[PDB]
Ligand binder design. Sequence first.
Ligand code: MG
Ligand code: MG
Ligand code: MG
Ligand code: MG
Ligand code: MG
Ligand code: MG
Ligand code: MG
Ligand code: ZN
Ligand code: ZN
Lengths: 43, 46, 177, 146, 36, 84, 199, 70
Amino acid sequence: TYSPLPDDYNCNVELALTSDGRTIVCYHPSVDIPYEHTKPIPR
Amino acid sequence: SKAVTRHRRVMHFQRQKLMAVTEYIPPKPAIHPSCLPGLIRLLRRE
Amino acid sequence: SSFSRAPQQWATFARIWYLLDGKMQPPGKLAAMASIRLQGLHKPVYHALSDCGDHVVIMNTRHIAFSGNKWEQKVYSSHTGYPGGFRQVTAAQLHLRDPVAIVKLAIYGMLPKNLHRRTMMERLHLFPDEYIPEDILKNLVEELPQPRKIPKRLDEYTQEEIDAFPRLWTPPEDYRL
Amino acid sequence: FREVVETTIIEGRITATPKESPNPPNPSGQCPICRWNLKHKYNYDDVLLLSQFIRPHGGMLPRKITGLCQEEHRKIEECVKMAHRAGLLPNHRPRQLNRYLTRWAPGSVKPIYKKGPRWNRVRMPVGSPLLRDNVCYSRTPWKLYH
Amino acid sequence: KNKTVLKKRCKDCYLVKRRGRWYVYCKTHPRHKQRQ
Amino acid sequence: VKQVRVQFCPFEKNVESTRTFLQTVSSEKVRSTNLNCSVIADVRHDGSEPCVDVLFGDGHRLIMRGAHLTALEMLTAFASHIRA
Amino acid sequence: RVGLIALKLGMMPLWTKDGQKHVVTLLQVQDCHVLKYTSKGKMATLSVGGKTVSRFRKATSILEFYRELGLPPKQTVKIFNITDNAAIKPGTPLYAAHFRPGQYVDVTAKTIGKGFQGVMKRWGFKGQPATHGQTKTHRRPGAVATGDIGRVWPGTKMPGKMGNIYRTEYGLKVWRINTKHNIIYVNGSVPGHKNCLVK
Amino acid sequence: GLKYPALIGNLVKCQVELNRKVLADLAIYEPKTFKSLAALASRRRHEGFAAALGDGKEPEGIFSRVVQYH
RNA sequence: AAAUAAGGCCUACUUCACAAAGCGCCUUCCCCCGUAAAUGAUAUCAUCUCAACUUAGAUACCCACACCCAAGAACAGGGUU
RNA sequence: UAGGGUUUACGACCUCGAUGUUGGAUCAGGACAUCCCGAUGGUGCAGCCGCUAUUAAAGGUUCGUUUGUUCAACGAUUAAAG
Ligand SMILES: [Mg+2]
Ligand SMILES: [Mg+2]
Ligand SMILES: [Mg+2]
Ligand SMILES: [Mg+2]
Ligand SMILES: [Mg+2]
Ligand SMILES: [Mg+2]
Ligand SMILES: [Mg+2]
Ligand SMILES: [Zn+2]
Ligand SMILES: [Zn+2]
């Protein structure tokens, strides 16, 4: 549930660690623009 | 200039630094005690 | 991502418009933020030769609040060409006669002292009231967080929070105040 | 809080009972601040604590009736002055511009037409000197002079 | 007058802070209106 | 500036407001202003002792009381009313 | 109210009932018509003309503007700062009857330009003496200003083009007016040479 | 949503030595990488604050605990 | 009513003439911070405020070839019915 | 105890392969430790004539006889000849 930064733009945040603790891993899936966060092309 | 002068001679940079670092630091009371806790016999006889 | 060469360049080197508001806030932090946004420092590709910047629009410049007693201390003086024209006007008088000058001079002095200062100033706009032209209004995009937090008077804390706050002492029941 | 009624007959009435909270947090103290643990955790923005020490018309209350300490009394007085100057007490008047964190009056400070050099610049006063022991919540000290 | 050490030679004198400085007014003897 | 009817007696809650009002400017010092005044008091049981019935020469009928009124405020009010 | 644009003919004296000489000027109100009207600048404005200049040595834009309206093209066009109350329609005349005696009316116009004059005639300097012991100093300006200051105070009195500029005169009483020839007799002199348009 | 001194300190307090040139290049051409780095820096800052407040006992920060060498 | 400094003029007066100049004539308008006063507390007296609030407390000129000129060294400007 | 470098010096630090030396003429820029026009407190202030302390420099600051001398004496002015 903890989140160091708000995952509402660019991508999410998921800091991971290996069993040996020697290499850090992450998972930053890109965020998709919702359908209700746009405007109709005026003409 | 001479050693002794009528006015206050400007001390050297290192001298001023040493004088400022060697200043007096009084204690810091964590609580301060400010916020902590004959003839009358003759009068009584009369 | 992809993005062709010319479109990607035009997008990464585009000019964005911002909006700032005063209303019981200091002018120093506002001018600093305006200069930071105009010089392009906020972007990761900041440089003078690149000529990167962003328009800054400030509204409600008449409700600026100074700290301490700067209203009767800060003297915005300016000497003219002819002799004896040494004008020494205070902050209160300058604001009463021109409410769109304090933040202007602040941002003029904050920006670097190069030839780009005039261009960065022209890129900025000011308005002493809520009325803003339609073009600028349509140009505005997003709204960065405000500087000050506003102290909030007693007529906004609601009765709930007031009752939640307990008392601290007991005046005599027969006190004439 | 009792009031003096007048109409010529001049009477009086008693109203508004104190009724303090039941269980204080830090009993066995002197001033209310020491009992509530707020010697260095309060400013001028929290007008809720300031309103409990101001007359109905804006005036101040004595120390013997409140029980605050001399230093605490002066601090509360300065905070009330700053709040009144900032316009945070519109319902406490005697009968254009915006200010806050002030120490002098608007009709007293003269315009600084001449400011000395860096080694003798007449800095402007900000805040108050009786609020230096407040928690900094940071690393840079309170800049009471610009 | 411009007196730094504001004295009170008379009994009716009293110190009061006014106009960014202290003054010494007196009704019975107004010969003490000093200035800082 | 005529006769005044001040009263006090151990009956109700004993408040020294009227006592202080009777023992103050009402002494011999200010009495020199009006020679034919002769302020008198009483000690009758009734209730609400501070019944200072100040009778003005013009016919104003000023009264001050009492159960929740100090002495300084009463004295200041009396002085203000006498000064017109 | 709207003003007039007359022509400074000449000057003549005029004695009052008290037996005293009082110089009076001449102002001929010729045509004087309104060109257009513009609402809110700081206040309403109105344009007024004067003499009738030939419509051959003018700009095409001016010719078109004056053709859209009646009358021929005028010489000058002085804009007056009038209020929103009085608003006369363009194309109306304004004779000398607009003003009446016993009224103070201001006048402004150019002045007899003396060209790039020297120093004395331009500012009234005393110059230098004739002898003891001048050799080439009689009308030149001596010192500029101080010595250490290696500059020159802007606006310092120096040789320049005297006159040939608009200057207004305040406080000029009117004595008599004419209706037939539309002449206005104003007290005191008036800036500008003879046969010169004045606002 | 971070500062340069605290960010650099948190990055140095994780055995992740990275010069400024690579950091700027990533921030310019890799916003997600810099976002993840800032998240890790904020996490390290919070862990250090919690440790200094409670002296650990006995978490020692899941991200802290440098890898010893010999 | 007179002068001071500034803005204009030759119709009366002069140097003088197809002009210009003064000795000759017309005009010149806004408060300035230094004080004295209601109402009350720290300091339930009293008290002008480096506490809250009230008293003596911008108007003006402007922004459509070629001949003569009161416009001008040229340039430029005004008129050429 | 604080401010002055305007008088007399004191030191010779670039300026003796050059900074032309005082008054007096036109022009004056600035500072107030303010002579006068504006406003106050006191006074050995019954009023003017006076004295003192604060602000205000937007303005004014004469005509002449002598000695080469700013300075130096004298006659008459205006509120003042700083
Ligand atoms: Mg001569
Ligand atoms: Mg000769
Ligand atoms: Mg030498
Ligand atoms: Mg030499
Ligand atoms: Mg030599
Ligand atoms: Mg040489
Ligand atoms: Mg002075
Ligand atoms: Zn305490
Ligand atoms: Zn006295």
